[PDB]
Symmetry: D2
C-alpha cells in the first residue's frame, strides 16, 4: 500500500512521477517515502542505484521497480509508456517478487564500516601504487599490484565487471566475482589474471602491504578510507527484491542491452 | 572394498600401481575393474580424465582419487610419496566424499547422442567457417561466427576455459560457463564477447546456420559429427565424487598451480 | 592499359563486371587477364584476397582496386555506384599508387616452400597438441603450447589478428604482428601472452618440439604440411600496390567498419 | 668526458655511485651534472625515468646508461658487478649509441604545455566520468567513455601498455600505441577496443565532451590539468640515446623480464 517514487529530476522524469502519483490516487495507495513497501525509480540505472541506497535499511520490506526514461537500464527495465499499466498492476498487487544477491564490504581500521552493493565494490590507491595481499578464506592467494580490484554482484556483472573482462553471470547464482584492473605481471610480480567467482560464505580479504589509504567505491559512491587494516568481501545475507509483472529474462535483457534491440 | 587403479603406463606410474596393489593386498580390499567403488588414477589430469570416462556409467557408486606422478594436477592432487598413507586411509574408509558438477552435451541429428564432461565441451567447424545461432532457454541470444565455442564445468574453468579468458569458479557452484574462441565483431557481426555463466536448468542450444558438420570435443575426445541439427548444453544432474582424506582447498589448488608452489 | 576484373560470381557482381568491361571498351583499355596492369576485384575481401593470390607473381606490375557489392571491405572499399566514375579515372590513369607491406612465410622440410600473405599466416596442429619453440632472430624466446599462432601484416591487423587481441596498426608501418591462440599458462608452461610487433628484417622462426605436422593457413588457404622442420616469418620485400583515386584514410576505414558508418 | 650519476638513494646505490666516481677519477672524465654527456642511473626503471626527465632539455647531447641494483630493469639493464667494466669502456669511449622514439604530449587551455614521455602518457578524469572524443588526424574516430586512455612509446609497450592488453613492439619502430582502460561498450556506447598503433606524423587528439578537468600522467608524474581544450599525442622528433657496450637485444630483454632469466 505504502509507496514512493524517485525521479532523475529532469522534466521528463518529474512529469512521469506526477502522473503516476495522480494515477495512484485512484487506488488504496498511500505515498510514504519513510516506510514504503513499493519503491519506484524513474531515470536510469544511476537513479535506481540511488533509490536502492536510500532504502537499504528496509530491503526486506520493499519491492523495487525501475522505469527507464532514456535507454534501457538493466535495473530500470520498463518503458515510460507502460506507466499506467504499471500503476494498475501494482495497485491490485498480487505480483511475484524476484530477488538478486548483494555484496557486503567490511572496512576495518585502527573500528569497522560495512557497505552493501548492488553493482560492485572497487578498491584503488589514494595516489600511490596499489599493492594488496589477497586472502581467500584465510589462505594467502596472491599479492596484487596494479590499478585496483573490482568485486561484483551477479547483476553487476554487466556493469563495471564487464568492462574489466569479467564473466556475465545469471543473478540466480549466489556469488560474487573479482576482476583485476591493470595488474603488473613480470618475473617479480604474479597475479592470477583471470576473474574469480566466489560462492556464498567465502570471504575475500584485502590486506595492505605498504600504504594503508585506499579509495573504495560502492556502486557510484567513492570514499577515501585512511588507516585501513582490511577490506572483507562476501555475498550478503541480504537480498534486493523486485516486483515483476511480466517475463523479461536476464539473458534477454543482456541481448537487448549489448547485441541488438 | 572393490577398487581399481589406472596408470599413465610409464615406468614410474606402473610401479606405483603395483606397490599400491601390494599394499591393498594387506587389507579387506578386492581389485575389481568392472564394478569398483574406489577408482585411483596414477598419471596426470589426462589420466584422471580417462579414468572418469572409463567409469562414467557408475559415477554415483564410485569415489575417485588422483595421484600425480609429474607436476600437480587439478584432479590428480596427491603426491606419489603419499601412496602408502593413501592405501591405509582408503582401506579403513570413513573418508568424506566431495562432489563436482558435470556438463551434459546433447547432439541431435536427422537421433540423439549425449556426453558427460568433467572439463569442457567445445564445438568447432569441420573445415568451413563456424557459424551458429546461440539460443538460451529458447531465446535467440546471438549469432556466433568465429573459431568455436567452449562450455566448461566449474572444475574445468582452470583448464581450456582459463586460456580463453573465462572466469575461474569454485566447484561448489552448480553452473557451466561459455567462452568464445576468436569471434568476429564488426558492423555486420556481433557477439557478447564476455564469458557467460549459466545456472542449473538453463539450456544453451547451438543451432547451425549453413554448414551442419562440426568437430565436437568432450574433454580430450574429439569427434566429427555430421548432419547436426542442434547441440544442447546444460549442467548435468550427475556428479563426480572424490574421496577426500585431507583439506586441499580449491583456491589453494589454484594458487599452487598458477601463482607459486 | 591492360586490365582484368574478377567477380564473386553472383548475379550482382557478374553484371557489374560486364558493365565495367563495356565501359572500358570506350577507352584505350585492353582486357588481358594474363599480364594485367590493373586488377579489379568485385565481391568482398575474400574476392580481393583471391585476386591478390591469382597475380602474386606480378605484384610490382599491378595496381589493385576493390569494389564491394556487399558490406564495406577493408580491401574492397569502393561502392558499386562508383563503378562508372572508376572506369573514367582508371582509363585516363594519372592516379596515385599506395603500397602495403606483405608477410613472407617459409616452410622447410627434410626442401622449402614460401608463401606471401596479405592478411596473415597462421599455424595450428594437425590434430595433436600444438607445441612450438619460438625463436626471434636466432634467440629462443618461448615455448608455445596451445591452439596456434597467427602472424599478421599491418592491413591484416583488422582481420583475424583483431579477433585474437592484436593491436590495429597503420599500414604504412613495415611490420608484422604475432598473436597467440589460447595459450596454456601455468607453473610449467609460460608464454608472453601479449601480441608482438616485429620490424622489417626480424625473423621469427617456429620450431617443432614433438609432432612435426602442422596446418598452415595463408590468408584463407589452409594446407597440411608434413615433416616440418621450421616455419620462418618475416616482412616481405614485396609490396601490394593499390590504385587510389581519392582519400579514404585507413583510420576512417577502421571507424566505418567497426564503430559506425 | 663530462658525466654524472644519479642514485636511488639507498645504501647499495649510493656506494656503487661513489665507487664509480672514484673509478672515473682515474681517467680523463669530469663529473658535471649541469652539462653531462654521459648520464648514469643507478636504481631501477623509476630511477632511470627520473634521470631522463632531469635532462630532457639536452637529450641530443647525452647518452644514458642504466644499472639495476635490484631486479632487471628494461632501461637499467646492466648489473652492478659490471660497474668497473662499465667505467673502463665509457672512459675510452668509442661505444655505439642506440636511439629510442619518444612521445610528445601537448595540452591546450583557454595557452599550451608540452611534455616528453619515455614510457607513456595517460589521461583520466579528475573524479567525474571520463568522456573524450578521439580524433585521428582531424577525423573523429570514436567517443571514449571509461576509466582512461594510455599512449605508449615503443619501449613503454612492456610497461603500463602491457598490463592494458597492448602489443609489445620493437623500439626501432617509430610509433606510439593507444590502449583503453575499462571502456564501456553497449547499445549506446562504442569504442574500438583494440590497441591502436600510430606511425610518425599522425596526431591523436583527445577533446573533452563535458568535464574539462583531467589527471594527466607522463611517465610517473601525475598532474591535474584544469580547463582543458585538447590533448594532442604524436611521436616526438626527439629521441633518447643509450650508450651500448654489448649486445642485449630487446626481445632477449623481453624474454628475461617476462618468460624466465
Ligand atoms: C559515471 C556515471 C553516472 C552513472 C553511474 N553508474 C550508474 C550505473 C549503472 C549500470 N548498472 C548496470 C548493470 N548492472 N548492468 C549493465 N549496465 C549497467 N549500468 C549502466 O552503466 C552506465 C552508467 N555508468 C557509466 O557511465 N560509468 C562510467 C563509465 C549506463 O549505461 C547504465 O545503464 C555507476 C556505475 O557505473 C559503472 N561503471 C563505472 N566505471 C565503469 C567503466 N569504466 N566501465 C563500465 N561501467 C563502469 C559501475 O558499475 C557503477 O556501479
Ligand atoms: C593435449 C594433450 C594431453 C592432455 C589432455 N588434456 C588433459 C588435461 C587437463 C587439465 N584439466 C585441468 C583443470 N581442470 N584445471 C587446470 N588444469 C587442467 N589441466 C591441465 O592441462 C594440461 C594438459 N592439457 C594440454 O596440454 N592441452 C593442450 C594445450 C596439464 O597441465 C593438465 O594438468 C585435455 C584438456 O586439455 C585442455 N586444453 C585443450 N586445449 C587447451 C588450450 N589451448 N589451453 C589450455 N588447456 C587446453 C582441455 O581442458 C582438455 O580437457
Ligand atoms: C570464412 C570465410 C570466407 C571469407 C574469407 N576471409 C576473407 C576475408 C577478410 C577480411 N580481411 C580483412 C581485413 N584486412 N580487415 C578487416 N576485415 C577483414 N576481413 C573481413 O573478414 C570477414 C570474412 N572472414 C570471416 O568471416 N572469417 C571467418 C570468421 C569479412 O567481413 C571481411 O570483410 C578470410 C579471412 O578471414 C579472417 N578470419 C579467419 N578466422 C577469423 C576469425 N576467427 N575472426 C576473424 N577473422 C577471421 C582471416 O583474416 C582470413 O584471412
Ligand atoms: C608505482 C611506482 C614506482 C615505479 C614507477 N614506475 C617506474 C617504471 C617502470 C618500468 N618501465 C618499464 C618498461 N619500459 N618496460 C617494462 N617494465 C617497465 N617498468 C617496470 O615497472 C615496475 C614499476 N612500476 C610499477 O610498479 N607501477 C605500478 C603498478 C618495475 O618492475 C619496472 O621495472 C612508473 C611506471 O609504472 C608503470 N605502471 C603504472 N601503472 C601500471 C600498471 N597498472 N601496470 C603496470 N605498469 C604500470 C608505467 O609504465 C609508469 O611509467
Amino acid at each position: 500500500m505504502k509507496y514512493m517514487i524517485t525521479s532523475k529530476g529532469d522534466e521528463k522524469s518529474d512529469l512521469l512521477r506526477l502522473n503516476m502519483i495522480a494515477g495512484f490516487g485512484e487506488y488504496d495507495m498511500e505515498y510514504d517515502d519513510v516506510e514504503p513497501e513499493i519503491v519506484i525509480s524513474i531515470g536510469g540505472d544511476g537513479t535506481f542505484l540511488s533509490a536502492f541506497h536510500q532504502y537499504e535499511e528496509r530491503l526486506d520490506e520493499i519491492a523495487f521497480i525501475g522505469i527507464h526514461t532514456g535507454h534501457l537500464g538493466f535495473y530500470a527495465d520498463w518503458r515510460p509508456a507502460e506507466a499506467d499499466k504499471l500503476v494498475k498492476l501494482l495497485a491490485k498487487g498480487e505480483y511475484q517478487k524476484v530477488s538478486y544477491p548483494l555484496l557486503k564490504t567490511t572496512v576495518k581500521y585502527g573500528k569497522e564500516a560495512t557497505y552493501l552493493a548492488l553493482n560492485e565494490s572497487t578498491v584503488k590507491s589514494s595516489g600511490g601504487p596499489f599493492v594488496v595481499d589477497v586472502v581467500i578464506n584465510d589462505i594467502h592467494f596472491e599479492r596484487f599490484r596494479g590499478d585496483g580490484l573490482c568485486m561484483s554482484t551477479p547483476s553487476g556483472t554487466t556493469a563495471y565487471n564487464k568492462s574489466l573482462g569479467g564473466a556475465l553471470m545469471h543473478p540466480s547464482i549466489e556469488a560474487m566475482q573479482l576482476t583485476e584492473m591493470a595488474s603488473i605481471n613480470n618475473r617479480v610480480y604474479r597475479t592470477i589474471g583471470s576473474p574469480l567467482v566466489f560462492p556464498k560464505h567465502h570471504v575475500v580479504s584485502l590486506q595492505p602491504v605498504n600504504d594503508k589509504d585506499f579509495q573504495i567505491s560502492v556502486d557510484h559512491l567513492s570514499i577515501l578510507h585512511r588507516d585501513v587494516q582490511e577490506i572483507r568481501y562476501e555475498v550478503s545475507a541480504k537480498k534486493i527484491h523486485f516486483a515483476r509483472f511480466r517475463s523479461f529474462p536476464f539473458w534477454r535483457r543482456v541481448h537487448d542491452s549489448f547485441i541488438e534491440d
